[PDB]
Amino acid sequence: GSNRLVVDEAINDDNSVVSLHPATMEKLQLFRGDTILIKGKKRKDTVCIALADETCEEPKIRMNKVVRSNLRVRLGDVISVHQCPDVKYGKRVHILPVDDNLFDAYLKPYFLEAYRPVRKGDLFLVRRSVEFKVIETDPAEYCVVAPDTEIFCE
Template sequence: MKKTTKAANRLVVEEAAMDDVSVCPLHPATMDRLSIYQGDVVLLKGNRCRDTVCLALPDEECPEHALRIGRATRSNLQVRLADVVFRARVPRRPVRRARARPPRRRHRRGPRGGPRRGVPQAPLPRRLPPAPLPTAIQHHKQMAEKLLQFKSIMHAN
Protein backbone atom coordinates (compact mmCIF):
# COMPACT_ATOMS: atom_id res chain seq x y z
CA MET A 1 0.00 0.00 0.00
CA LYS A 2 1.51 3.31 -1.12
CA LYS A 3 1.35 6.27 1.15
CA THR A 4 0.89 9.51 -0.81
CA THR A 5 0.93 13.11 0.33
CA LYS A 6 -1.45 15.95 -0.42
CA ALA A 7 1.04 18.80 -0.96
CA ALA A 8 3.90 18.59 -3.42
CA ASN A 9 6.48 19.67 -0.89
CA ARG A 10 5.55 16.96 1.64
CA LEU A 11 7.42 13.72 1.04
CA VAL A 12 7.38 10.26 2.64
CA VAL A 13 10.61 9.12 4.32
CA GLU A 14 12.24 5.95 3.00
CA GLU A 15 15.47 4.11 3.83
CA ALA A 16 18.51 5.36 1.92
CA ALA A 17 20.70 2.93 -0.01
CA MET A 18 23.83 4.67 1.27
CA ASP A 19 24.04 6.22 4.71
CA ASP A 20 25.37 9.64 3.71
CA VAL A 21 24.18 12.43 5.98
CA SER A 22 24.67 15.25 3.50
CA VAL A 23 22.52 14.02 0.57
CA CYS A 24 18.85 13.21 0.02
CA PRO A 25 18.01 11.39 -3.24
CA LEU A 26 14.75 12.36 -4.99
CA HIS A 27 13.04 11.13 -8.14
CA PRO A 28 13.86 13.42 -11.13
CA ALA A 29 10.14 14.05 -11.77
CA THR A 30 9.73 15.20 -8.17
CA MET A 31 12.73 17.48 -8.55
CA ASP A 32 11.20 19.01 -11.70
CA ARG A 33 7.82 19.47 -10.01
CA LEU A 34 9.43 21.18 -7.00
CA SER A 35 11.89 23.15 -9.19
CA ILE A 36 14.92 21.69 -7.44
CA TYR A 37 18.12 21.17 -9.37
CA GLN A 38 20.90 18.70 -8.73
CA GLY A 39 23.14 19.93 -5.90
CA ASP A 40 20.64 22.45 -4.50
CA VAL A 41 20.55 22.85 -0.74
CA VAL A 42 17.22 21.58 0.58
CA LEU A 43 15.78 22.34 4.02
CA LEU A 44 13.92 19.39 5.58
CA LYS A 45 11.53 19.99 8.47
CA GLY A 46 10.57 17.07 10.69
CA ASN A 47 8.71 16.54 13.94
CA ARG A 48 8.85 18.95 16.89
CA CYS A 49 10.20 21.87 14.82
CA ARG A 50 13.37 19.96 13.95
CA ASP A 51 15.08 20.85 10.68
CA THR A 52 18.25 20.02 8.79
CA VAL A 53 19.76 20.73 5.39
CA CYS A 54 21.08 18.38 2.73
CA LEU A 55 21.95 18.33 -0.97
CA ALA A 56 19.36 17.13 -3.48
CA LEU A 57 20.47 14.40 -5.90
CA PRO A 58 18.40 12.70 -8.62
CA ASP A 59 17.69 8.98 -8.15
CA GLU A 60 15.66 6.96 -10.70
CA GLU A 61 15.00 4.14 -8.21
CA CYS A 62 13.37 6.43 -5.65
CA PRO A 63 9.53 6.60 -5.83
CA GLU A 64 8.02 9.93 -6.92
CA HIS A 65 6.31 10.66 -3.62
CA ALA A 66 9.29 9.67 -1.46
CA LEU A 67 12.54 11.03 -0.13
CA ARG A 68 15.44 8.77 0.83
CA ILE A 69 17.43 9.88 3.84
CA GLY A 70 19.90 8.06 6.06
CA ARG A 71 19.55 7.02 9.66
CA ALA A 72 21.54 9.93 11.11
CA THR A 73 19.45 12.48 9.20
CA ARG A 74 16.23 10.77 10.32
CA SER A 75 17.39 10.92 13.91
CA ASN A 76 18.22 14.65 13.52
CA LEU A 77 14.70 15.26 12.21
CA GLN A 78 13.15 12.89 14.80
CA VAL A 79 11.21 11.02 12.10
CA ARG A 80 10.83 7.31 11.33
CA LEU A 81 10.36 5.42 8.10
CA ALA A 82 7.03 6.20 6.37
CA ASP A 83 6.68 9.55 8.20
CA VAL A 84 6.05 12.71 6.21
CA VAL A 85 8.61 15.56 6.06
CA PHE A 86 8.20 19.08 4.73
CA ARG A 87 10.68 20.20 2.10
CA ALA A 88 11.77 23.79 1.35
CA ARG A 89 14.50 25.06 -0.95
CA VAL A 90 17.11 27.27 0.65
CA PRO A 91 17.74 30.42 -1.43
CA ARG A 92 21.22 30.70 -2.89
CA ARG A 93 23.46 33.36 -1.43
CA PRO A 94 26.55 34.73 -3.09
CA VAL A 95 29.82 33.60 -1.61
CA ARG A 96 31.39 36.38 0.43
CA ARG A 97 34.96 36.76 1.51
CA ALA A 98 35.73 37.29 5.17
CA ARG A 99 37.58 40.49 6.01
CA ALA A 100 39.46 41.12 9.20
CA ARG A 101 38.85 44.62 10.48
CA PRO A 102 40.31 46.34 13.51
CA PRO A 103 37.89 46.96 16.37
CA ARG A 104 36.01 50.21 16.38
CA ARG A 105 37.36 53.02 18.51
CA ARG A 106 34.37 52.77 20.82
CA HIS A 107 35.27 49.18 21.64
CA ARG A 108 38.96 49.89 22.19
CA ARG A 109 38.01 52.59 24.63
CA GLY A 110 35.03 52.64 26.92
CA PRO A 111 31.55 53.43 25.60
CA ARG A 112 32.06 57.16 26.25
CA GLY A 113 35.62 57.38 25.00
CA GLY A 114 37.40 56.97 28.34
CA PRO A 115 39.61 54.06 29.33
CA ARG A 116 37.90 50.71 29.86
CA ARG A 117 37.41 49.75 33.46
CA GLY A 118 38.42 46.33 34.69
CA VAL A 119 40.59 45.68 31.65
CA PRO A 120 44.31 46.33 32.06
CA GLN A 121 45.49 48.94 29.62
CA ALA A 122 48.83 48.65 27.88
CA PRO A 123 50.93 51.78 28.35
CA LEU A 124 51.18 53.97 25.30
CA PRO A 125 54.65 54.04 23.74
CA ARG A 126 56.55 57.17 24.74
CA ARG A 127 58.70 59.20 22.42
CA LEU A 128 62.35 59.18 23.29
CA PRO A 129 63.72 62.54 24.45
CA PRO A 130 65.93 64.28 21.91
CA ALA A 131 69.65 63.59 22.13
CA PRO A 132 71.37 66.15 24.39
CA LEU A 133 73.26 68.87 22.57
CA PRO A 134 76.97 69.12 23.36
CA THR A 135 77.68 71.70 26.01
CA ALA A 136 79.90 74.67 25.29
CA ILE A 137 82.85 73.12 27.14
CA GLN A 138 82.61 69.87 25.13
CA HIS A 139 82.32 71.88 21.95
CA HIS A 140 85.47 73.89 22.78
CA LYS A 141 87.39 70.68 23.59
CA GLN A 142 86.40 69.13 20.24
CA MET A 143 87.40 72.25 18.35
CA ALA A 144 90.75 72.38 20.19
CA GLU A 145 91.50 68.75 19.28
CA LYS A 146 90.71 69.39 15.62
CA LEU A 147 92.95 72.47 15.66
CA LEU A 148 95.83 70.49 17.17
CA GLN A 149 95.43 67.78 14.51
CA PHE A 150 95.46 70.41 11.78
CA LYS A 151 98.60 72.07 13.20
CA SER A 152 100.43 68.75 13.49
CA ILE A 153 99.63 67.95 9.85
CA MET A 154 100.80 71.39 8.72
CA HIS A 155 104.10 71.19 10.67
CA ALA A 156 104.80 67.73 9.34
CA ASN A 157 104.96 69.07 5.79
Protein backbone atom coordinates (compact mmCIF):
# COMPACT_ATOMS: atom_id res chain seq x y z
CA GLY A 1 0.00 0.00 0.00
CA SER A 2 1.51 3.25 1.22
CA ASN A 3 4.99 3.37 2.74
CA ARG A 4 4.49 6.63 4.67
CA LEU A 5 3.42 6.50 8.32
CA VAL A 6 2.44 9.00 11.03
CA VAL A 7 4.85 9.01 14.00
CA ASP A 8 3.49 7.91 17.40
CA GLU A 9 4.73 7.36 20.95
CA ALA A 10 6.27 3.97 21.78
CA ILE A 11 5.44 1.93 24.86
CA ASN A 12 8.60 -0.11 24.35
CA ASP A 13 11.70 2.06 24.86
CA ASP A 14 14.20 -0.21 23.05
CA ASN A 15 16.23 2.21 20.94
CA SER A 16 16.39 -0.41 18.17
CA VAL A 17 12.66 -1.11 17.82
CA VAL A 18 9.69 0.48 16.13
CA SER A 19 6.19 -1.01 16.21
CA LEU A 20 3.59 -1.22 13.41
CA HIS A 21 0.03 -2.46 13.29
CA PRO A 22 0.15 -6.01 11.87
CA ALA A 23 -1.87 -5.03 8.78
CA THR A 24 0.66 -2.33 7.95
CA MET A 25 3.38 -4.94 8.41
CA GLU A 26 1.85 -7.28 5.89
CA LYS A 27 0.86 -4.51 3.47
CA LEU A 28 4.57 -3.57 3.35
CA GLN A 29 5.56 -7.24 3.25
CA LEU A 30 7.39 -7.02 6.57
CA PHE A 31 7.82 -9.92 9.00
CA ARG A 32 8.14 -9.62 12.75
CA GLY A 33 11.76 -8.83 13.60
CA ASP A 34 12.91 -7.74 10.14
CA THR A 35 15.16 -4.73 9.62
CA ILE A 36 13.71 -1.66 7.92
CA LEU A 37 15.48 1.55 6.96
CA ILE A 38 13.08 4.33 7.99
CA LYS A 39 13.62 7.67 6.24
CA GLY A 40 13.15 10.84 8.27
CA LYS A 41 13.78 14.58 7.92
CA LYS A 42 16.83 16.57 6.73
CA ARG A 43 17.65 13.38 4.78
CA LYS A 44 18.46 11.54 8.01
CA ASP A 45 17.65 7.82 8.20
CA THR A 46 18.19 4.82 10.50
CA VAL A 47 17.75 1.06 10.58
CA CYS A 48 15.32 -0.45 13.08
CA ILE A 49 13.71 -3.76 14.03
CA ALA A 50 10.02 -3.97 13.13
CA LEU A 51 7.69 -5.55 15.69
CA ALA A 52 3.97 -6.11 15.09
CA ASP A 53 1.55 -4.42 17.48
CA GLU A 54 -2.25 -4.54 17.54
CA THR A 55 -2.34 -1.43 19.70
CA CYS A 56 -0.66 0.61 16.90
CA GLU A 57 -2.90 2.45 14.46
CA GLU A 58 -2.61 1.26 10.87
CA PRO A 59 -1.53 4.68 9.40
CA LYS A 60 1.04 5.03 12.15
CA ILE A 61 4.28 3.69 13.63
CA ARG A 62 5.27 3.56 17.31
CA MET A 63 8.84 4.70 17.88
CA ASN A 64 10.72 5.91 20.98
CA LYS A 65 12.36 9.31 21.54
CA VAL A 66 15.89 8.17 20.68
CA VAL A 67 14.68 7.20 17.20
CA ARG A 68 12.54 10.36 16.83
CA SER A 69 15.55 12.60 17.38
CA ASN A 70 17.74 10.48 15.11
CA LEU A 71 15.05 11.08 12.49
CA ARG A 72 14.42 14.62 13.77
CA VAL A 73 10.67 14.16 13.73
CA ARG A 74 7.97 15.17 16.21
CA LEU A 75 5.02 13.09 17.34
CA GLY A 76 2.63 13.55 14.44
CA ASP A 77 5.13 13.72 11.57
CA VAL A 78 5.37 11.43 8.55
CA ILE A 79 8.17 8.92 7.98
CA SER A 80 8.59 6.42 5.19
CA VAL A 81 9.82 2.88 5.65
CA HIS A 82 11.74 0.53 3.41
CA GLN A 83 12.72 -3.10 3.29
CA CYS A 84 16.43 -3.33 4.16
CA PRO A 85 17.53 -6.90 3.31
CA ASP A 86 21.08 -5.97 2.23
CA VAL A 87 22.28 -5.62 5.85
CA LYS A 88 24.84 -8.02 7.27
CA TYR A 89 26.48 -8.34 10.67
CA GLY A 90 29.38 -6.10 11.61
CA LYS A 91 33.15 -5.98 12.08
CA ARG A 92 34.34 -2.52 13.23
CA VAL A 93 31.81 -0.27 15.04
CA HIS A 94 33.29 2.93 16.58
CA ILE A 95 31.18 4.53 19.35
CA LEU A 96 32.12 8.01 20.69
CA PRO A 97 30.70 8.87 24.20
CA VAL A 98 28.82 12.08 23.40
CA ASP A 99 28.30 13.44 26.93
CA ASP A 100 31.99 14.45 27.10
CA ASN A 101 36.21 -1.70 31.23
CA LEU A 102 33.97 1.07 32.62
CA PHE A 103 33.48 1.88 28.91
CA ASP A 104 32.00 -1.62 28.53
CA ALA A 105 30.20 -1.68 31.88
CA TYR A 106 27.53 0.15 29.89
CA LEU A 107 28.25 -0.82 26.30
CA LYS A 108 28.96 -4.54 26.43
CA PRO A 109 25.69 -5.07 28.37
CA TYR A 110 23.64 -3.13 25.85
CA PHE A 111 25.02 -5.16 22.94
CA LEU A 112 25.28 -8.56 24.61
CA GLU A 113 23.42 -11.03 22.35
CA ALA A 114 21.10 -8.13 21.50
CA TYR A 115 22.00 -8.11 17.78
CA ARG A 116 21.17 -4.43 17.44
CA PRO A 117 21.12 -2.47 14.15
CA VAL A 118 23.57 0.40 13.73
CA ARG A 119 23.77 3.22 11.18
CA LYS A 120 26.64 5.68 10.66
CA GLY A 121 25.77 8.64 12.89
CA ASP A 122 23.09 7.31 15.27
CA LEU A 123 22.79 8.63 18.80
CA PHE A 124 21.52 6.22 21.44
CA LEU A 125 21.21 5.74 25.21
CA VAL A 126 22.12 3.02 27.74
CA ARG A 127 20.68 2.89 31.28
CA ARG A 128 22.31 6.96 35.21
CA SER A 129 22.51 6.65 31.42
CA VAL A 130 24.87 7.73 28.65
CA GLU A 131 24.56 8.80 25.00
CA PHE A 132 26.76 7.41 22.26
CA LYS A 133 27.33 8.49 18.65
CA VAL A 134 28.22 5.67 16.31
CA ILE A 135 30.83 7.54 14.28
CA GLU A 136 32.14 4.52 12.35
CA THR A 137 30.59 1.28 10.98
CA ASP A 138 32.22 -1.59 9.04
CA PRO A 139 29.96 -1.42 5.85
CA ALA A 140 30.31 2.39 6.30
CA GLU A 141 26.49 2.66 6.13
CA TYR A 142 24.75 0.16 8.46
CA CYS A 143 25.65 -3.12 10.20
CA VAL A 144 24.35 -5.48 12.93
CA VAL A 145 26.36 -6.52 16.01
CA ALA A 146 27.03 -10.22 16.07
CA PRO A 147 28.92 -11.66 19.08
CA ASP A 148 32.13 -11.29 17.00
CA THR A 149 31.71 -7.57 16.27
CA GLU A 150 34.40 -5.13 17.42
CA ILE A 151 33.22 -2.22 19.60
CA PHE A 152 36.60 -0.55 19.37
CA CYS A 153 35.70 2.63 21.21
CA GLU A 154 35.64 3.98 24.77
